[PDB]
Design a protein around this ligand. Structure first.
Ligand SMILES: [Zn+2]
Length: 7
């Protein structure tokens, strides 16, 4: 699975 962090 792909991941995205929007800090
Ligand atoms: Zn993954």
């Amino acid at each position: 699975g792909s991941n995205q962090n929007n800090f």
